[PDB]
Amino acid sequence: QYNNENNFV
C-alpha cells in the first residue's frame, strides 16, 4: 500500500 499527498500553493 502506497499513500501520499502533494499540495502546491
Q: From CA 7, how far away is CA 4, in angstroms rounded?
A: 10
Resolution (angstroms) equals 0.9
The technique by which this structure was obtained is electron diffraction
Q: From CA 8, how far away is CA 2, in angstroms rounded?
A: 20
Q: List the grid coordinates of 6.
A: 502533494
> Position of cell 499540495?
7
> Position of cell 502533494?
6
3-class DSSP string for 1-9: CCCCCCCCC
Maximum pairwise Cα distance, the chain: 27
